[PDB]
Each structure stands twice: as structure tokens, then as C-alpha cells.
Amino acid sequence: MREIVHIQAGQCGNQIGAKFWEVISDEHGIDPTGSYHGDSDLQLERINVYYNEATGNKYVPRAILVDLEPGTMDSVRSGPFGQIFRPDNFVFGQSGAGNNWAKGHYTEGAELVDSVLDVVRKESESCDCLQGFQLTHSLGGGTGSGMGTLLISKIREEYPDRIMNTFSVMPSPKVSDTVVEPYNATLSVHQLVENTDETYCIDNEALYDICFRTLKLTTPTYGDLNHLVSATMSGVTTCLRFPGQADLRKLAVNMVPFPRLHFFMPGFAPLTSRQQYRALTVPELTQQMFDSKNMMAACDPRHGRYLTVAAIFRGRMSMKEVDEQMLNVQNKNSSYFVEWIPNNVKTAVCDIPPRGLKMSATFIGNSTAIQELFKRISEQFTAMFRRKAFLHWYTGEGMDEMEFTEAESNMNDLVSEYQQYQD
């Protein structure tokens, strides 16, 4: 009984988190009312990892919904699986965060953080053996970014020896709500460097390009982008939710050779456009899974090197054929894998495929190429900070320019740290 506590904060965080529970609920056979209706015992074997068991064989997700405005979480509650979430687990304010990290981290967020921790403490107290936490949020807004990282700092204080895992949507100018997103992202990235064991980097530009060039969606919507995140979140957590020949701490021990370089690039395959019925072969599944176009951090892996790689194959397939194709990609591109971590490419199989797919593959890479992402954010940050543009939104909340200069240096440090291991 290795329970995980799930938290979703802010607009992006609650919308992506909502679809996530919708996706995995279908996989485990939990209907929108929390009643099981599957046909395999594999669906319930690891069910207590994300679900609490209530009276009458009901399964209630172990999730806490958090926001500084009611709007999004009202949509969640009215959504399809809205009734599945614990009504107590809705914690929200009325002020909003105005896409302001300072409002989420110091002012508006600070007034509400204690009540969120009261719900977290309640869910952890009823865990037989709590693995750790996972947070879904964006870094470009105010609540998920500012208050999300505030929650992490306070959760690590109360649970210092638990694993802290996040799914973090990185802002992109091509899919942008406000011009201050590089400010909020740089401020959050330093928090994650300090207070997370694993962070799954999700670039909204990668999701957009994938929806446009690959999926062939003329005008992608946030809904379309979230379908990709839902699929990917389901793939990376397959190790945790189903029986297989792994706990968060074990995953971290094999993915993180250095404490600060714990930012992962996820990947998914297939990514087909509506030729959608064609069977996908193991070689095809592998070739796409490692293809940059299939990756969601918007970083070319052929610009850096892989410290560690974890691939998860789902569905009934030839495990011998899986090993042959994986060992073929390494032995055909070993120049992009660091040679001082022997066997840094692992592979796992799962017999239950996603909904509507004969077999899929999910990619988890700890690549030094991730530095290009932080580089983009840093450049966009300095483009404005050098002119102190838009700072008044943050200084009016109590912040000082110094805190910005330090976040600027902290991120540039992070880039230099990735750079040394790339050579």
C-alpha cells in the first residue's frame, strides 16, 4: 500500500489534472460515480495508489483541487468525473492571482496555503505508507506557479523524506496568455530545483507543434493540448498503477544522478492523425518514441545527451522484440547517451494498453538538452528585466528587484550545470 497524494493547482493545473483522473479512471474501471465496473483484476491490484476506498466499494481519487479563483474548479465539479472528487478536497479563494507569481507565493497564496495543508495532512494521515506527492500545474500563471511552489516548500517542511514529483507546464510565446510568463516561470524553476525530486517538463510549444504538424490540427485549443498531457501522464504513471516486474523513490534513484538535474522530457507514441486504424509495429513504436517530434519538452535531444532513459511499453506485444528494438536504438545512436552511466536505458512492459490503442510507448528522458528550454525562458526573462518592464506588478506585492536578479542567476547556474555534463 504505497499511496500517492495528488494535488492540482491553478487553471492549467486543474484542467490537466481533471483529464488525468478522467483517463486513468477509465483504465482502472472507475465510473464517474466512483463505482468499479472493470473486467480484470489488474485494474484493482494497485488501485489504492491513487484512489481511496470508501463505503459501498466506492473509489474516491486521492486528489486535492486548489485555486485562488472559483471559475475553473466550478467547471471541474460540473465536468463528467466531477462528482468523483471528494467535495472536501476543493480548496479555493475568490481574489485570483492575476497571473502574478508574487500574488500566488506571498500574498493571496499565503492566506490560503494553511487550509490546503489541512486537507493534505488529512489525506496523508490515512495512508498506510505514503510514497510521496505529485503536483500538476503551470509555471506561467500565478496560482499553479506561485502558490504551487509555495505548497511544495511547505509540504517538504512537514514531509521532508517523501518524494515530491511535479508535472510542470512551461510557458511558450506561441501559446501565451500574458507577457509576464517568463517572470513567473523563472521564479518557479528555482523552487523546483530545490524542492522536487522529479519534474516532468511539458512545453506548451511542443504540444502545439505536435497538434499542428503531426496530429494535423489546424487550430489547436487548450483542450487539444491537454489530451496530449493526459495521455502522457497516464503513460509515465503506468509503472505505479499496474503490476509489473517500482516506487517513486526507486524511480528517482535510477533517473537522477545529480540532485539538481531532475527535469525530465516525456514522450508518447503513437501520435496519429485521423490511417488511424493501422497496426503500429514495435520498430515504428520505438522509432517515433525517440523522435524529437514525439517529445513534449520542445528540445532537440540531438543537441544534448541522455543521462538516463526510461521507456514503458503497453499492450500485448513481443517483449523479445521490444528488447531487440530498444537495444537497436542505443547501439545505433550511442553518441547521444553518456558513456559513464552503464545501462542508462531501461525498459518496462505493461499488458494493459491505453483506451483505444493496441499498444503504446511512453518516454521518460533525463537529457542535458533540457537546458535549451531553460535557455529560452532565461532569454525572454532578461529581455524584459534588463528594462525592468512589468516589474511594478511584482514590487507592488512586496517583492524586490534583488529576488529577480537571484532567480536570473539561479537559472543560468542550472544551464551551466547541464552544460558541463554535456561535454
Binding site: 531487440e324 537495444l327 537497436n328 542505443q330 547501439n331 545505433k332 550511442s334 553518441s335 558513456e339
Partner: protein, 352 residues
Amino acid sequence: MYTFVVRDENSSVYAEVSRLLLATGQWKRLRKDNPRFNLMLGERNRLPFGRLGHEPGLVQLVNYYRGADKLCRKASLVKLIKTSPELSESCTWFPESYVIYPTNLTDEREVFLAAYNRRREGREGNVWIAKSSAGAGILISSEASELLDFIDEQGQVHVIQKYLEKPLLLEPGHRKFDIRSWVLVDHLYNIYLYREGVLRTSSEPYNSANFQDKTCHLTNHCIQKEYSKNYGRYEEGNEMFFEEFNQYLMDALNTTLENSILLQIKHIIRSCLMCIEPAISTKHLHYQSFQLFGFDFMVDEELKVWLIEVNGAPACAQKLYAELCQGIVDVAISSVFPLAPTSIFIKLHHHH
């Protein structure tokens, strides 16, 4: 796409093989410390055989046979011939040799003196040569006192073997020579002899009354090109090839290279490699080995072939680099890693 590493930057042979491998567009070179390789062109000394054949999904091949040093070491070869029943002590194609350790360190000193005194008493030619693997350091003399006293002044094991006092002399010139034969042994332990050999000839007339000046006694390519004043006189680079040498054996001796010499060389090569096969074969090993060998022979005036030594990291004559190196890629590397004639070798069939 196959992958290979290069761990011996000084090998002229595999420098060309690597150049040929990349010219096919189907072989990729990795850093010398990358373990995910199919082929390793390994180092000469302390090659880490123990780390080969442990990569999941990789068939790995190395250009050296672990344990072949028993054959390519001066004292090792002597001990191997004297202790192996397949070769026996009465080996008719290997000069009477003895392993002698300097007195500052089993040893065959007394056994050598016994056979030495017998020759001295029987009016027989008693000229021996003392050499070692640590030389560029060779001494030729008919007095055992000088041979032994020369080894003690050194600090490494040496070998004293009978000096061929009646070598076959090429004319014109009256000059000594040795024969280099390149042999390739693949992973299946097929023994392939390169059809092209080289005679490394002495450009100085053979003088049996003065072993002090070793220019006409040592046919080494470096000794002739450094201390010999007639280098390149009769043949380019003191290197006569088989076509010319066979034509000479016909005009002068009314015989051929195949009958008078090559049959003995092929017999010697089989006997040596078949002997150690059970000890170095990789037939049931988790990795595969192949290796190029350099056999050096001497021919006496009776047209009897003698084995001098075997080289485990041989070089090749300039004119034969392209042909032989390509041949290595064909039967040793591509036979294990195929790509997407009239063979240049001579298969010496044998019982495994």
C-alpha cells in the same frame, strides 16, 4: 549500422582496416572507451578480454586471441614446443633452443651446456644466437662463455638457439634472407594463409668468419636500412616478393616455391595453430576472436624450412596493405557482420 572502437593508434594494419570499414558506409566508429561496440581493434598489451561479450544484444568481436602469446613470445614458443606432445622436443622444423634466465633472477642453462659441449667435442659447427623479446639486442658467437655472459648483463629472459650456419644464399650477392608469411585465423578457427609473402633480404654478402658485424646476418628491415651500405641494391627496400623469388628458384634451383618451401611453411603454420587451438579457441565463448599472425622462416642450403618466430602484431609490406587489409575485412569482419574472387588466402583445412 555496425560499430567498432580503435584502441591501438600505432597499428598500421588496422589503421587501414578502420579506413576501409568507414568507406563502406555501414560501420560507425565510437570512442575507444564506449562499451556498445560490435568490433574492437584492441590494444597490444593487457587487452581487457574479461569485459567482452557482456553487452545485451551486442555480438562483439576482437582482433586478438586471448592466450596467443604462448606462440608469439621467444621463451613462450620454446617452452610450448618442448612441452607440447603435438610438437614434441624432437621437432624437426624448429632450431634447438633453450630458455636461459639471467643469473640475477625453469632455466635450461645446464641442459644447454651439455648439448654445447657435445658439439664442441664432435667437431660440429657450434654457433648459437642469443636473443630476447625485449630487443629492438642480439649476440651471435661460437663461444658459450660470451653468450651466457651477455645475458647476465641484461635483466630479462633470453633464448639461445642454434644459428643456421648453412643458410640459402640468393645470387648474385651471396646474401641471407628470411621469409614473412601473414596468416589469418577467423572466429571459426579457419587458418587462412595470405598468398603473398615477402623475403626480407640482406643487401650484404653472408660472411661466416665474422659474426661481429651483424649486418649480413640479421635480415631485419631496420638493420639493413640503417647499418647496411647496399640497401635497395638488388630489390627495392630489400623486399623480394614471391613472384620474383619463385622465378629465381626455377632458373637457379630448377624447383618452385610451392614444392621446395611453401609446403613446409603451410605444414609449420598448421602444426603451430592446431596445437594451441583447444587453449585459445572461442568456439563456445561469449565473445569471438580473430587475429593476424606474422610467421618468420629461415631456409638452409638444403631447401629445408625452419621456424624463427611468430609475431602477434605484425606489419605488412607497403605494396600489400590494400590487398591484405581488404582481405581481413572480408573473411574476418564481414563474415561475422555481413554488409548489405578468387580468394587471396589459402585455406589450410584441419581437424578441429
